[PDB]
C-alpha cells in the first residue's frame, strides 16, 4: 500500500495477519511445537530519487506475536526483523547498514520457500546465515552493468557483544556471487568472523573464528520452483544439549536442503522438501543430527492478498538423538491476510 | 483511514491517542488505581473480494501504553489486542482464527459501553468472556439469509498452556445466538472448556472444566442506549486473595451489568451503570463480592475524531472485603484523538 | 505522509530508519558506547477542525531499537516517545495531556540540534527537562494574538510513583516564556516538584523538592544556527556512582550548552558544540563533572528524505572522574531514511 508518491519519494506501508496453529503429539518432543502460533507483521519500505544516478532507500519491519497473553508473556517473540537504510548509485552498486540478512542467506534463500517451515539452517543472530544486526552490505547487480545476470556482494559484519553467547558475534567479512540465466540461478556465498570470548567460553564449540559457506541452484520458471542448497559451518551453528542442559556451537555442520514446488494457475501450490543438517566433533557427543525431515505441504492462493496453507513435517530425527532434538512430526495450518 | 482501495482489496489504517488520568485517594485500595493511564492504539483492517460470493479479511491491533518510563518498565501493558484472519462466504457464514473475542463476549458486549470503565467480567485470557488467543470462530448472520436479525456463532477454543494459571486454558467449545428487531437485541451465549493441570493445581478453584454463560438485552435507537447482562461462571473467573497472597479461579460467580445512556445531538452523552459480581464457594472464604459499584459519567463527542470524558465509579465494595478487593472510588478523565 | 484529508481531519503517518554505528576504544569507558545503534521510529499526527475557532489534535510516536537480537534482549530500548491529545482554541491557547516534553525543554530544545549527540541534560523521566509521562500543558502563542513572537506555557506535572527512583516524580508545576524577533529567540523556563519518598530514600540527593530552570538564546536565519543554554538543577539530575555502585540525584548541577552550525545550499551542514554540566554537594564526592566535551560533526542532507552524518565527541571528562563517568571519545556514523 503506497501511502506516498511525490517528487520521486515513494513509501509503501505493508503488513499481514497470520492465523496459525501447530499440531504435534501431546509437543515438547516435536519438530515445531504444539498450539497457537498466530502473529502479525508491520513495516514500511521507502525509496527516494536524489538525482538521476543516485537513489536512497530505507526499510523497517516488526514482528508482533499474537499467541501471547496480556500478562507477563505479552511481548514474547516480538522483535525487529529488518531495519536499515542505504544508497544505490547508477551502476556502481548499493550500500546499506542496519539489521539485514547475512550474505550467506544469499545462498540459503534459494530453499527458504516452504509454506511455514524450512530454512532451518538460516538462524537469526548467527553471523551470516539469517537476520543479523549491524551489517554493512555492498551489492552489485549485472556486474557494474557489464554482465547481465551476474551479481555479487560483500558484507562487513560488525561485532555485537551481547549478554548471551547464542546472540553474539565478532568482526567479520563475507561475500557472495550469483549468476541467473534462462530460468536458472547459481550462487555461492562465504563468511568468516571472530567468536567473542563469551562464545569461546562455552562448553560446546572450540575455535577462535566462525565460518559459514553455502552454494545453491534453483529453477524458477514455468510455474515450477526447484532448489538445492549445500552448506558447511565451523564453530557457527547454535546447538543445545537438552540432556546436560548445556549450550554452544557445533564445531562443524554439514547442511542439505532441497525443495520442489509447482504453482497451479488456480492458486494451489503443492510442495515437497528435504532438510538434513549433521553436527560433527561435538564435545561429549561426537556426531549427531540436528535436522532431518521430509516435508509435504501446499498453499492455496486465493489472490495477492489471501492464502491458506498446510505444512506437514515427516520428522526423521530419532527418539534416541544424543542432543535431545525432538523426533515427533508437526503439522501447521495457516490463514494469511496481507496487504 | 483507507490507505488502499483497488481491485476489491481495501485496507484501513486506524489508531487513537488517549490522554487519561485516574484519581483515587492516596490508590492501592481503589477500584481503578491512581495516576496517569495514557495509552495509544494502532491497527489495520483488510477485506479482499476473492470472487462474487467469497471475501477474505484480516485485522490486527496493538496497545502501546504511554504511562510508562523509558527504562525497565517501558513495555508494561503493551500487548496485541486482536490478530486474526478469515473468510466469509455468501450466505454460508464466516470463519476466522487468531486472537479474537470469546463468544460469550457476544453477550457481554451489550453492557461494555461506559466511557472508561465497565465490562468488568469480560476478562482477557479467560476462556470465552474477552480477548483470548487461539480461537476459531464460525459466524452466521441472518440465519443463512433466511431470517433477518437472527445470528449465531460457534467457537472452538484451542488449549493455551502458559507459564501462569491465570492466562491458560484447555480445549473448549462455545456458541451464541442473537436476535435483533425494531431497535432491540436479545442474545445468549455459552462455553465450556478443560482447565489445565496448572489451573487445577491452584488453591482457589476446584473442577475439571470451566464454564461461562450469559444472556443480555439491549435497546439502541432514538439516541438511547440501555442494556442488561446476566452471567454465571464455574471455575472460570480469575480471583486473588490479597490477604493470603494466593490466586486462582472462583468456583462460581453470578454477574449483573446494567447500563443506561442518552446521546444528545450536540455531542454530550451522559451515562449511568451498575455492576455486581459475587463469588461463591471460594476455598477459605465462602462467598464474597468481586465487583459492586454504580457508575455516573459522560462523554463529549466534538466529532468523529475527538472526544472528552469523565467517568465516576461510586464503589460499593466494602472496606472489610474478604479477598482484599479495593473499596475506594475512582474518577477517570480522558481526552481522545482517533482516526 | 498524509493518509487522510477530508472534512477538516488530516492524519500524517511518519517514520524513519536510522542505520547507526558508534566507535569508541575497546567501550565501557567512553562517552557514548561502542557498536551498533540502529533504530527506527513510527508515529502519527492528527488535527481535526471541530469548529472555526476550535481544533483538536493527537500525536503518538514509538521507538523500536534495531540493534537487539531476537532473544531475551529483543525489546531493549523500545518505548513510547510521545503520546498525547489536546485542544487548541482560537486565541485562548491550547491544552494537552499525555507523554510530552517537560516545559524546561522549551529552553533546552535550543541547543538539542547536533547530528547524533547533545541535549545531554534533557533527561527522560526527569521532571521537566525531557520526555515525561503525565504532563498537562497549557500553551499560548503570540500572547492571545496581542503580541507577535511572545509565547508562554504552564505545565502541571502529575506524580508518577514508579518502581525505581530514577523514573519517578511527584506533583509539580512549571512554566516558560519565549520571545522571537527578526531571526532571534530568547526563552526562560522553570519548574518545581515534589520528590517521592523513594527518591528521598536514595543515598545521592537530599531534599523534599526538585527544581530545574534554564534560559537560552538562539539565532536561526541566513543558513546559520547558533544557540546557548544555561541551566541549574537542585535534587533533580540523575547520577550514578560507578565506584560504589550507588545511584540518586545531584544536589545541584550547573549546565552550559553551546552550538554553532551552518547549512550549505548543497546539503552539507557542519557543526561545533560544547557541553559542560557540573555536579555539586554530592554525598561522598562533593563536586564532580557529569558532562564535559567539545563536538565536531556534520550532516549531509541529500534531500527531505535522506541524510548521512558523522558526529565526533572530543571527551574532556578525565580518567580519574570521581563518579566513574567515562572519559573516552566517541564517533557516530549514521544514515537516515525518513518519510
Ligand atoms: Zn529475514
Ligand atoms: Zn477486545
Ligand atoms: Zn522527545
Between the CA of B59 and the centroid of ligand 2 the distance, in Å, is 12
- CA atoms of C44 and B65, how far apart (whole Å): 15
What are the DSSP E strand ranges found in chain C? 2-6, 9-23, 35-36, 39-49, 54-65, 79-89, 93-101, 131-140, 150-157, 172-181, 184-194, 209-221, 224-241, 246-262, 268-282, 286-301, 306-315, 330-338
- Is residue A287 within 8 Å of residue A309, measured between CB atoms? no
Say if CB C79 and CB C99 are below 8 A apart.
Answer: no
Shortest Cα distance, chain B CAs vs residue A63, angstroms: 11
Between β-strands B9-23 and B224-241, what pairing exists: parallel, antiparallel or unpaired?
Answer: unpaired
Q: How far apart are the first and last CA of chain C?
A: 7
Measured CA to CA, the distance from residue B19 to residue B35 in angstroms comes to 11
Output the CA C336–ligand 3 centroid distance in Å: 18
With an 8 Å Cβ cutoff, are B164 and A71 in contact?
A: yes
For residue C337, CA distances in Å to C37, C77, C228, C298 come to: 15, 20, 29, 17
Given phi > 0 = left and psi -120 to 50 = alpha, else beta, which region is A145?
A: left
Contact B133 A68 (CB under 8 A): yes
Pair B225, B118: CB distance under 8 Å? no
Question: What single string gives the DSSP state of each residue in B90-111?
Answer: TTTEEEEEEEEE-TTHHHHGGG
Cα nearest neighbour of C67 on chain A: A133
- Element (H or E) spanning A150, and its range? strand A150-157
The DSSP result for B121-165, as a single string, is T--SSSTTSSEEEEEEEEEESTGGGTSTTEEEEEEEEPPB--SSS
Determine the distance from the C-alpha atom of residue A110 to the mean position of all C-alpha atoms in its chain, rounded to a whole number: 10
Contact flag A87-C335 (C-beta cutoff 8 Å): yes
Please give the helix or strand (H or E) that residue B279 lies within, else none: strand B268-282
Rg (CA), chain C: 20
Contacts of A10 in chain B (CB under 8 A): none
C-alpha A236: how far from chain center: 15
Question: Which chain C residues contact residue A98 at CB under 8 A?
Answer: 17, 19, 38, 66
Nearest ligand by distance to the CA of B84: 2
* B314 within a domain of the structure (yes/no): yes
Total number of domains in chain B? 1
Sign of CA pseudo-dihedral A258, A248, A83, A172: negative
A66–B158 CB contact, under 8 Å: no
- Residue B40 near residue B17, CB atoms below 8 Å: yes
Per the rule left: phi > 0, alpha: psi between -120 and 50, beta: everything else, B92 is alpha
Identify which of A185, A125, A188, A110 has the alpha carbon closest to the alpha carbon of residue A153.
A188
Q: What is the CATH number of the domain that holds C96?
A: 2.40.160.10
Question: What's the gap in Å between the CA of B298 and the closest CA on chain C?
Answer: 18
Picking from C11, C16, C19 by the largest number of A CB atoms within 10 A of its own CB, the best residue to mutate is C19
Smallest CA–CA distance, residue B261 to chain A, in Å, is 30
Whether C134 and B38 lie within 8 Å, measured CB to CB: yes
Between CA C303 and CA C285 the distance in angstroms is 49
Q: Across the interface, do A38 and B75 touch by the CB < 8 Å criterion? A: no
Asked if residue B138 lies in contact with residue B94, where contact means CB atoms within 8 angstroms, the answer is yes
d(CA A236, CA A157): 14
Discontinuities in chain A (C→N > 2.5 Å), after residue: 26
If residue B215 lies in a helix (H) or strand (E), which one and from where to where?
strand B209-221
Backbone angles phi, psi at C197, to 5 degrees: -55, -35
Shortest Cα–Cα distance, B134 to chain A (Å): 5
Do residues B246 and B207 touch, judged by C-beta distance below 8 A? no
**Which residues from A are below 8 Å from C266, CB to CB?**
none
The residue of chain A nearest to residue B82, with distances taken between CA atoms, is A66
Q: How far off is chain B from A304, nearest CA to CA, in Å?
A: 9
Are A48 and C21 inside 8 Å of each other by CB? Answer: no
Of B46, B78, B164, the CB nearest to A337: B46
Chains linked to A by 3 or more Cβ pairs within 8 Å: B, C
Separation CA B112–CA B124 (nearest Å): 14
For residue C37, the distance in angstroms to the closest alpha carbon of chain A comes to 8
- Give burial (CB, 10 Å; 0-12/13-18/19+) of C327: middle
How far is residue B84's CA from residue C164's CA, in Å, rounded to a whole number? 37
Contacting residues of B for C124, CB less than 8 Å apart: 69-70
Structure's resolution in angstroms: 2.6
Q: Which ligand is nearest to the CA of C82?
A: 3
- Neighbouring residues of C165: CB distance < 8 A, sequence distance ≥ 6: C196, C198, C199, C201, C202, C247, C248
Question: Does B65 map to a domain?
Answer: no
Residue B216 sits in which domain range?
72-338
Sign of CA dihedral A336, A339, B2, B6: negative
Q: Identify all chain C residues contacting B67, using CB atoms and an 8 Å cutoff.
A: 99, 133-134, 160
Give residue ranges of A with CB < 8 Å to any C CB.
3-4, 9, 11, 13, 44, 46, 48, 50, 54, 56-60, 62, 75, 78-80, 83-87, 96-99, 124-125, 131, 133-134, 158-164, 166-167
Specify the 3-state DSSP secondary structure of C71: coil
Q: Given an 8 Å threshold on Cβ–Cβ distance, is B134 in contact with A21?
A: yes
Phi, psi for residue B98 in degrees, rounded to 5: 145, -155
From CA B85, how far away is CA B99, in angstroms rounded?
9
Contact B188, B177 (CB under 8 A): yes
Does residue C33 form part of some domain? no
Structural domain includes residue B139: yes
Task: Please state whether B91 falls in left (phi above 0), alpha (psi between -120 and 50) or beta.
Answer: alpha
Instruction: Report the gap between the CA of B123 and the closest CA in chain A (Å).
Output: 10
Please name which of C131, C200, C140 lies closest in space to residue C170, comparing C-alpha atoms.
Answer: C200
Single out the residue of C283, A59, C59, C198 nearest to residue B338, CA to CA.
Answer: C59
How far is the centre of ligand 2, averaged over its atoms, from the C-alpha of A70 (Å)?
11
**Cβ-Cβ contacts under 8 Å, A15 against chain C:** none
Nearest residue, CB atoms, A35 vs list B87, B160, B166: B160
Residues with CB under 5 A from ligand 1 (ion): A 131
Q: Which ligand is nearest to the CA of A108?
A: 1
Check chain B for breaks (C–N over 2.5 Å) and list the residue before each, or none: 26
Report the first-to-last Cα separation within chain A, whole angstroms: 7
Ligand at shortest distance from the CA of B133: 2
Query: H or E stretch including A200?
Result: helix A197-200
CA nearest neighbour of A336 among A14, A18, A15: A18
Helix (H, G, I), strand (E, B) or coil at C273: strand
Cα(A133)–Cα(A255) distance, rounded to whole angstroms? 24
| Dihedral (Cα; A29, A30, A34, A38), 10-degree rounding | 130
**Cα torsion through B203, B207, B208, B212, rounded to 10:** -110
C114 CB contacts (<8 Å, ≥6 apart)?
C259, C271, C273, C295, C297, C311
Q: Is the CB of B40 less than 8 angstroms away from the CB of C48?
A: no
Q: What residues have CB less than 8 Å from C216, skipping those under 6 apart?
A: C107, C108, C110, C111, C185, C186, C187, C188, C227, C228, C229, C230
Contact yes or no for A69 and B160 at CB 8 A: yes
Residue C44 CA to ligand 3 centre (angstroms):
14
- Residue C239 Cα to chain centre, angstroms: 17
**Closest ligand, as measured to the CA of A84:** 1
On whether residue B324 sits in a domain, the answer given is yes
Closest residue in chain C to residue B23, using alpha carbons only: C158
Q: Which residues pair with C139 in a beta bridge?
A: C94, C153
The minimal CB distance from C67 to the residues A46, A60, A133 is found for: A133
Nearest ligand by distance to the CA of B109: 2
Q: Counting Cβ atoms within 10 Å, is residue B53 exposed (0-12), middle (13-18) or buried (19+)?
A: exposed
Q: B175 and B157 in contact (C-beta within 8 Å)?
A: no
Beta bridge partners of A150: A179
Between CA C275 and CA C258 the distance in angstroms is 7
Residue A167: its chain C contacts at CB < 8 A?
A: 69-71, 73
Nearest 5 degrees, angle CA C26-CA C28-CA C29?
90
User: What distance in angstroms lies between residue B82's CA and the mean position of ligand 2's atoms?
Assistant: 7
Residues of A in contact with C38 (CB under 8 A): 83-84, 97-99, 133-134
Give exposure, B19-32, as e/b (b: 16+ Cβ within 10 Å).
Answer: bbbbbbeebebbbb
Instruction: Please tell me the distance from the alpha carbon of residue B80 to that of residue B78, in angstroms, as a whole number.
Output: 7
Pairing of strands C39-49, C35-36: unpaired
CA distance B154 to B177: 9
Cβ neighbour number for residue C182 with a 10 Å cutoff: 7
Cross-chain CB nearest to C335 (options A62, A85, A134): A85
How far is A30 from B108, CA to CA, in rounded Å? 38
Number of C-beta neighbours around residue B256 at 10 A: 17
Mind telling me how many Å the CA of A68 is from chain B's nearest CA? 7
Upper half-sphere CA count for residue A138 (Cβ side, 13 Å) = 12
Number of other CB atoms surrounding residue C171 within 10 Å: 12
Amino acid at each position: 500500500a503506497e501511502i506516498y508518491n511525490k517528487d520521486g519519494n515513494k513509501v509503501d506501508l505493508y503488513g499481514k495477519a497470520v492465523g496459525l496453529h501447530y499440531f504435534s503429539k501431546g509437543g515438547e518432543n516435536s519438530y515445531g511445537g504444539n498450539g497457537d502460533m498466530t502473529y502479525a507483521r508491520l513495516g514500511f519500505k521507502g525509496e527516494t530519487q536524489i538525482n538521476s544516478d543516485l537513489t536512497g532507500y530505507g526499510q523497517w519491519e516488526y514482528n508482533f506475536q499474537g499467541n501471547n497473553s496480556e500478562g507477563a508473556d505479552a511481548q514474547t517473540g516480538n522483535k525487529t526483523h529488518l531495519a536499515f537504510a542505504g544508497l544505490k548509485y547508477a551502476d556502481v552498486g548499493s550500500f546499506d547498514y542496519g539489521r539485514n540478512h547475512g550474505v550467506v542467506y544469499d545462498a540459503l534463500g534459494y530453499t527458504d520457500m516452504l509454506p511455514e517451515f524450512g530454512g532451518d539452517t538460516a538462524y537469526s543472530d548467527d553471523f551470516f546465515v539469517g537476520d543479523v544486526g549491524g551489517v554493512a552490505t555492498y551489492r552489485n547487480s549485472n556486474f557494474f552493468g557489464l554482465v547481465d545476470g551476474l551479481n555479487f556482494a560483500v558484507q562487513y559484519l560488525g561485532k555485537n557483544e551481547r549478554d548471551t553467547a547464542r546472540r553474539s558475534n565478532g568482526d567479520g567479512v563475507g561475500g557472495s556471487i550469483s549468476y541467473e540465466y534462462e530460468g536458472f540461478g547459481i550462487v555461492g556465498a562465504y563468511g568468516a568472523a571472530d567468536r567473542t570470548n563469551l562464545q569461546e567460553a562455552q562448553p560446546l564449540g572450540n575455535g577462535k573464528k566462525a565460518e559459514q559457506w553455502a552454494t545453491g541452484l534453483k529453477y524458477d520458471a514455468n510455474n515450477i520452483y526447484l532448489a538445492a542448497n549445500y552448506g558447511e559451518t565451523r564453530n557457527a551453528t547454535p546447538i543445545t544439549n537438552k540432556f546436560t542442559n548445556t549450550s554452544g556451537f557445533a564445531n562443524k555442520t554439514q547442511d542439505v536442503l532441497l525443495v520442489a514446488q509447482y504453482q497451479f494457475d488456480f492458486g494451489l501450490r503443492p510442495s515437497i522438501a528435504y532438510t538434513k543438517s549433521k553436527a560433527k566433533d561435538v564435545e561429549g557427543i561426537g556426531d549427531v543430527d540436528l535436522v532431518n525431515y521430509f516435508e509435504v505441504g501446499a498453499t492455496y492462493y486465493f489472490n495477492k492478498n489471501m492464502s491458506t496453507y498446510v505444512d506437514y513435517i515427516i520428522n526423521q530425527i530419532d527418539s534416541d538423538n544424543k542432543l535431545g532434538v525432538g523426533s515427533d512430526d508437526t503439522v501447521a495450518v495457516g490463514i494469511v491476510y496481507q496487504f
